[PDB]
Amino acid sequence: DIMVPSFVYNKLPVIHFLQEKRAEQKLRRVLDETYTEWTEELDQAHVTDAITRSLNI
Amino acid sequence: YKGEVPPHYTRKSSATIEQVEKEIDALLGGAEKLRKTSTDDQPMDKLTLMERCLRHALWSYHKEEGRYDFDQIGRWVVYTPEDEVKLAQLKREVEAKEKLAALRKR
Amino acid sequence: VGNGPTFSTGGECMNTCDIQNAFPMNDRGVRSSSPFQEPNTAIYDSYLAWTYFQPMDVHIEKLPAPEAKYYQRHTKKPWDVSSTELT
Amino acid sequence: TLQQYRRASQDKRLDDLVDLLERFKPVLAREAIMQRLTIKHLEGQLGVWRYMD
Amino acid sequence: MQGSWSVLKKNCSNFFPGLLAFAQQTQEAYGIWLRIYNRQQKYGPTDFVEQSETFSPDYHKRFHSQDKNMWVDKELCTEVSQKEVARLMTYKLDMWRMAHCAGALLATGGYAIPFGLFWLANDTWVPSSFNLTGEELRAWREAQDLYRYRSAPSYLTDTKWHFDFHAYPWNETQERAWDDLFEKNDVRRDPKVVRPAAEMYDGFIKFELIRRKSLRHLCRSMNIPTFPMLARLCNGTRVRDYWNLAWCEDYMVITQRLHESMTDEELYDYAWRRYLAPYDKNLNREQLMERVEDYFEFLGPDFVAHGKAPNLVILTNYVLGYYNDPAYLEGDISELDKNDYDHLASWGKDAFLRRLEFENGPLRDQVEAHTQRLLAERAAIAK
Numbered sequence: 267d268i269m270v271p272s273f274v275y276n277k278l279p280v281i282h283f284l285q286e287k288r289a290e291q292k293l294r295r296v297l298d299e300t301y302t303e304w305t306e307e308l309d310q311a312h313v314t315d316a317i318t319r320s321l322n323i
Numbered sequence: 324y325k326g327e328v329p330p331h332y333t334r335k336s337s338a339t340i341e342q343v344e345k346e347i348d349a350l351l352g353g354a355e356k357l358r359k360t361s362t363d364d365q366p367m368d369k370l371t372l373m374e375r376c377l378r379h380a381l382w383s384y385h386k387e388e389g390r391y392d393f394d395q396i397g398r399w400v401v402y403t404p405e406d407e408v409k410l411a412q413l414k415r416e417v418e419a420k421e422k423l424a425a426l427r428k429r
Numbered sequence: 430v431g432n433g434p435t436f437s438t439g440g441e442c443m444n445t446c447d448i449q450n451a452f453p454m455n456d457r458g459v460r461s462s463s464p465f466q467e468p469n470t471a472i473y474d475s476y477l478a479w480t481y482f483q484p485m486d487v488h489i490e491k492l493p494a495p496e497a498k499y500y501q502r503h504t505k506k507p508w509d510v511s512s513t514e515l516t
Numbered sequence: 517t518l519q520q521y522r523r524a525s526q527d528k529r530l531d532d533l534v535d536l537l538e539r540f541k542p543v544l545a546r547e548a549i550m551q552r553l554t555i556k557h558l559e560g561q562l563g564v565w566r567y568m569d
Numbered sequence: 570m571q572g573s574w575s576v577l578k579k580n581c582s583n584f585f586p587g588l589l590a591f592a593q594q595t596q597e598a599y600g601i602w603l604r605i606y607n608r609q610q611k612y613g614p615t616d617f618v619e620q621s622e623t624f625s626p627d628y629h630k631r632f633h634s635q636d637k638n639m640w641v642d643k644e645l646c647t648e649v650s651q652k653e654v655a656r657l658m659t660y661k662l663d664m665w666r667m668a669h670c671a672g673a674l675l676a677t678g679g680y681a682i683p684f685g686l687f688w689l690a691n692d693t694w695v696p697s698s699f700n701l702t703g704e705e706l707r708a709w710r711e712a713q714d715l716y717r718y719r720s721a722p723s724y725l726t727d728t729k730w731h732f733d734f735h736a737y738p739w740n741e742t743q744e745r746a747w748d749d750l751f752e753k754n755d756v757r758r759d760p761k762v763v764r765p766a767a768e769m770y771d772g773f774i775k776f777e778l779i780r781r782k783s784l785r786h787l788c789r790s791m792n793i794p795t796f797p798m799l800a801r802l803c804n805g806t807r808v809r810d811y812w813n814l815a816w817c818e819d820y821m822v823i824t825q826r827l828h829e830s831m832t833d834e835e836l837y838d839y840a841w842r843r844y845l846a847p848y849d850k851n852l853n854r855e856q857l858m859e860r861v862e863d864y865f866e867f868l869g870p871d872f873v874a875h876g877k878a879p880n881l882v883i884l885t886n887y888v889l890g891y892y893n894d895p896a897y898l899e900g901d902i903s904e905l906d907k908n909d910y911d912h913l914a915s916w917g918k919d920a921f922l923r924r925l926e927f928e929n930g931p932l933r934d935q936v937e938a939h940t941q942r943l944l945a946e947r948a949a950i951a952k
């Protein structure tokens with residue numbers, strides 16, 4: 267009725283702070299893993315060159 | 324050049340891109356009053372981080388699909404000088420193809 | 430404003446306690462008496478220094494109510510008794 | 517042909533975006549809850565039992 | 570789970586059939602254990618057979634050592650099948666509880682009868698053989714899962730709090746592993762990220778140095794009876810034997826890929842015996858397979874290569890993390906619009922409260938300025 271309640275009440279602030287920091291860390295890790303992937307596609311000049319060769323030019 | 328068509332993938336959930344964009348807009352609209360701007364070098368907020376991640380993914384998907392809206396892509400996807408160079412290279416290519424098609428038609 | 434109490438301090442000064450970092454600091458440089466943010470926190474100097482927070486009427490931009498799905502967790506167990514019920 | 521090639525990756529990206537949205541929503545819910553708790557705390561009408569619950 | 574009259578009737582009706590089934594299972598499990606023990610004594614390493622002594626560095630108290638006193642029989646499949654091992658493990662649990670009850674009966678003569686009535690009113694400590702139908706078995710499994718939920722969080726908190734209060738990780742990867750190890754079951758933990766915690770805790774505490782209170786909590790979470798607990802080297806031996814059998818079966822399955830061919834119910838039971846899959850979660854085959862693969866990955870390649878599992882304390886914490894449900898939160902957010910100290914409104918504010926409100930209220934700056942100016946004037950006049 268007296269002791270354990272008081273010590274729990276004393277614990278609350280530090281635990282709240284640490285859990286907030288942990289959530290911020292999770293969000294930071296989520297953001298840090300985001301990279302924009304620039305894809306590379308076959309240049310159409312080679313396609314045009316192959317078209318010309320097929321014409322026997 | 325590509326090689327083989329990549330192995331088929333089954334979606335875990337069903338949802339359209341338009342629906343996802345609408346949901347994102349709804350989520351970010353309720354926090355507009357709470358959202359506060361700050362200097363670029365200053366630390367970011369939770370709302371700003373969520374907005375950046377969501378918009379980055381959305382616009383990456385759009386650019387892969389074909390909806391080349393450079394105005395928003397340059398904002399929600401550019402974070403590296405290499406990214407800026409790639410965007411500029413892409414921007415020239417799309418405009419060049421559009422001009423070429425128009426004059427080839429004319 | 431009401432006369433109600435606030436988060437208990439134990440008669441301690443949070444600017445010098447061993448867990449002071451857990452208490453946010455306001456613009457004036459006075460650490461809060463609680464994990465919450467307090468703008469008008471003060472320190473009084475009796476034989477020992479102690480922190481105080483005076484409740485006041487302040488408006489805060491209230492984020493709209495979320496859905497019950499995203500904050501309710503129905504993991505309750507027969508042995509579980511809530512803090513309100515215990516009180 | 518290109519669309520067929522860039523299909524599985526697009527579906528995975530869409531699913532990941534949906535999961536990210538569902539992951540972010542609880543954070544906003546917690547933020548709103550903390551806002552309300554702080555509002556009641558500033559009014560001196562917040563009990564520690566309510567805060568813990 | 571709390572006792573009830575319906576469960577009492579169920580257990581009373583099935584008491585004698587349950588005893589007969591338990592005796593038959595006892596004969597079968599004695600045969601299986603005879604085979605296993607003969608194989609261990611014949612092909613076991615010298616240290617394992619001779620029971621090498623490992624003493625603590627502080628009080629020189631002997632306890633089982635994971636490396637020496639635990640041995641994985643890679644070639645046990647020739648003599649004993651996986652199903653036989655699972656049967657032996659289940660019978661070991663049931664026999665432990667039955668032995669404790671029988672010891673109580675022998676000790677207290679005929680005065681244990683009302684305590685027996687209490688015992689039969691709850692499925693927590695009755696053998697699985699007392700259930701003769703699917704619904705009864707489901708209720709029994711629910712009771713066991715409830716006990717696991719009741720017990721595991723205390724063990725996890727004990728471990729985490731002790732380590733964090735008395736030590737910190739060395740490097741960032743260890744920090745990430747430690748933080749992600751004790752996440753709630755609602756999120757999926759990556760075994761590769763979490764594995765380094767095993768070595769870190771080996772640096773902190775091994776299975777040979779496990780404290781008696783932590784052991785009691787673990788045994789509670791494993792549905793192992795704890796009264797009379799006695800010295801820590803009895804339930805410790807029980808835990809070692811159970812996990813050695815589990816590791817042998819796991820090696821057999823990994824080598825032979827039995828889990829892929831394993832049926833849904835058998836797969837669920839296999840995960841349950843590893844404390845990975847509660848029955849109340851209604852998991853499907855996909856989730857069970859994911860959890861089992863994560864468990865195998867956590868064991869690591871070294872388990873197959875040499876039969877060496879990671880630190881048993883960390884393994885137990887990792888597996889029991891699936892019973893660490895998120896903290897319950899019930900009630901609409903609108904409840905936050907109420908007030909808690911309305912009953913004090915009639916009392917109002919006294920002189921001291923009015924003074925505090927005046928000094929620290931919105932007029933605080935004006936009061937501070939006036940007070941400081943007055944004090945400065947008085948000091949100047951004094952000088």
Ligand SMILES: CCCCCCCCCCCCCCCCCC(=O)OC[C@H](COP(=O)([O-])OCC(O)COP(=O)([O-])OC[C@@H](COC(=O)CCCCCCCCCCCCCCCCC)OC(=O)CCCCCCCCCCCCCCCCC)OC(=O)CCCCCCCCCCCCCCCCC
Pocket residue numbers: 595598599602664665666667668669670671672673675676797803804806807810
């Ligand atoms: C009539 C006189 C009465 C005297 C007073 C008694 C008062 C009560 C005290 C308790 C007495 C025992 C109660 C019955 C227990 C059941 C039998 C048993 O041991 O079960 C195995 C099991 C062994 O546990 P374990 O942790 O697995 O053992 C680890 C070993 O490494 C295991 O080794 P392993 O890994 O190699 O595996 C071996 C395993 C492999 O086998 C198997 O796997 C097959 C299964 C075998 C076991 C089956 C057990 C079945 C239990 C249920 C029985 C049915 C109950 C029905 C109830 C309802 C009835 C209507 O086989 C065994 O379990 C063998 C264990 C060794 C034998 C122990 C028995 C020794 C005493 C009997 C001989 C006495 C001779 C007297 C000669 C006199 C000369 C003058 O027993 C227990 O669960 C332990 C007992 C738990 C209660 C402890 C309570 C405190 C005890 C303090 C005693 C102090 C000394 C006495 C004075 C007290 C003063 C205060």
Ligand SMILES: CCCCCCCCCCCCCCCCCC(=O)OC[C@H](COP(=O)([O-])OCC(O)COP(=O)([O-])OC[C@@H](COC(=O)CCCCCCCCCCCCCCCCC)OC(=O)CCCCCCCCCCCCCCCCC)OC(=O)CCCCCCCCCCCCCCCCC
Pocket residue numbers: 570571572669670671673674681682684685686687688689690691693694796
């Ligand atoms: C036919 C059947 C088949 C054959 C038989 C088979 C064998 C059967 C036997 C074996 C069975 C084993 C399994 C048993 C499981 C159930 C155990 C149990 O009791 O569970 C709690 C059980 C309920 O269990 P549950 O609801 O299922 O919940 C279980 C949960 O999992 C909760 O689980 P938990 O783990 O949280 O609960 C554990 C809890 C268990 O404890 C409890 O829960 C406490 C139970 C009692 C609570 C009483 C509260 C009410 C008090 C009322 C006071 C009087 C009121 C006014 C009356 C006015 C009347 C006119 O705590 C403990 O375990 C503590 C252990 C303490 C050990 C003590 C050792 C002392 C050693 C001494 C030192 C020695 C040192 C060495 C010295 C050496 C020197 C050389 O409690 C009850 O049912 C309460 C019964 C209350 C009866 C009425 C009050 C007492 C009446 C006394 C009448 C006296 C008449 C004569 C008077 C003469 C005057 C001259």
Ligand SMILES: CCCCCCCCCCCCCCCCCC(=O)OC[C@H](COP(=O)([O-])OCC(O)COP(=O)([O-])OC[C@@H](COC(=O)CCCCCCCCCCCCCCCCC)OC(=O)CCCCCCCCCCCCCCCCC)OC(=O)CCCCCCCCCCCCCCCCC
Pocket residue numbers: 669670672673676677680694785794795796797798799
């Ligand atoms: C606000 C006021 C309210 C009222 C308050 C009332 C006043 C209280 C004031 C004082 C209170 C504190 C007293 C402390 C004393 C010192 C204790 C101490 O040093 O303990 C060290 C140490 C601590 O125990 P532990 O094993 O480390 O863990 C204890 C935890 O509680 C284990 O917890 P856990 O969570 O790890 O495990 C939970 C679960 C785990 O589940 C299991 O383990 C499965 C189920 C196991 C069933 C039991 C198996 C027993 C096996 C045999 C044990 C050895 C027997 C030795 C030979 C027999 C000696 C008599 O175990 C249970 O549920 C146990 C159920 C036991 C129910 C009985 C509790 C007592 C209720 C009263 C009944 C008797 C009333 C007599 C007086 C009235 C007569 C008219 O004790 C032991 O080593 C245990 C030795 C037990 C020996 C037998 C009992 C000897 C005492 C005399 C018995 C007389 C019987 C009379 C029958 C009727 C005659 C007419």
Ligand SMILES: CCCCCCCCCCCCCCCCCC(=O)OC[C@H](COP(=O)([O-])OCC(O)COP(=O)([O-])OC[C@@H](COC(=O)CCCCCCCCCCCCCCCCC)OC(=O)CCCCCCCCCCCCCCCCC)OC(=O)CCCCCCCCCCCCCCCCC
Pocket residue numbers: 629630631632799800801802803
């Ligand atoms: C209602 C019933 C009432 C009953 C009352 C009787 C007492 C209670 C009965 C039993 C209660 C149940 C629980 C008992 C404790 C269980 C402990 C435990 O968990 O052990 C696990 C443990 C199993 O674990 P483990 O891994 O297999 O082996 C342990 C490891 O080695 C561990 O490795 P470690 O690294 O820890 O190695 C160290 C370990 C090594 O020790 C061991 O563990 C080995 C086993 C013990 C060996 C003990 C004998 C040593 C040699 C004695 C030589 C004496 C020569 C004298 C010559 C005289 C010539 C004139 O421990 C020691 O070094 C301790 C040595 C003993 C020191 C004794 C100091 C006494 C000082 C006396 C001061 C003065 C007294 C007053 C004045 C008297 C004179 C006027 O069990 C044992 O090893 C043996 C357990 C034996 C249990 C006690 C059996 C009781 C039998 C009672 C029969 C009589 C009944 C009378 C009834 C009367 C009417 C009611």
Ligand SMILES: CCCCCCCCCCCCCCCCCC(=O)OC[C@H](COP(=O)([O-])OCC(O)COP(=O)([O-])OC[C@@H](COC(=O)CCCCCCCCCCCCCCCCC)OC(=O)CCCCCCCCCCCCCCCCC)OC(=O)CCCCCCCCCCCCCCCCC
Pocket residue numbers: 630780781782797799800801802
């Ligand atoms: C309602 C009330 C009614 C009246 C009640 C009257 C009460 C009388 C008050 C006086 C009693 C004082 C004794 C209290 C015992 C409880 C202490 C305790 O729980 O401490 C917790 C203590 C704290 O542990 P922790 O802090 O969690 O962890 C620290 C370590 O990590 C732990 O790690 P660890 O477990 O590895 O290390 C410990 C272990 C390490 O060592 C081992 O593992 C090796 C084991 C070696 C065993 C050697 C046995 C030698 C026996 C020789 C017999 C030869 C045969 C003789 C035959 C002819 C003569 C009969 O060594 C031991 O603990 C065993 C030491 C030797 C035990 C001897 C048997 C018990 C004697 C009790 C009576 C003492 C005199 C009383 C009168 C004077 C009082 C001032 O834990 C233990 O000690 C655990 C073991 C507890 C075993 C003793 C209790 C067994 C159950 C008793 C059954 C009989 C019940 C009779 C009921 C009577 C009712 C009237």
Ligand SMILES: CCCCCCCCCCCCO[C@@H]1O[C@H](CO)[C@@H](O[C@H]2O[C@H](CO)[C@@H](O)[C@H](O)[C@H]2O)[C@H](O)[C@H]1O
Pocket residue numbers: 606607608610611
């Ligand atoms: C009241 C007491 C209750 C006791 C309950 C438990 C009883 C258990 C009995 C087990 C009997 C096992 O039987 C025993 O096994 C061992 C190990 O295979 C055999 O051991 C044999 O092979 C081993 C291994 O190569 C050799 O080290 C040993 O020299 C040789 O004898 C014994 O020859 C056999 O007799």
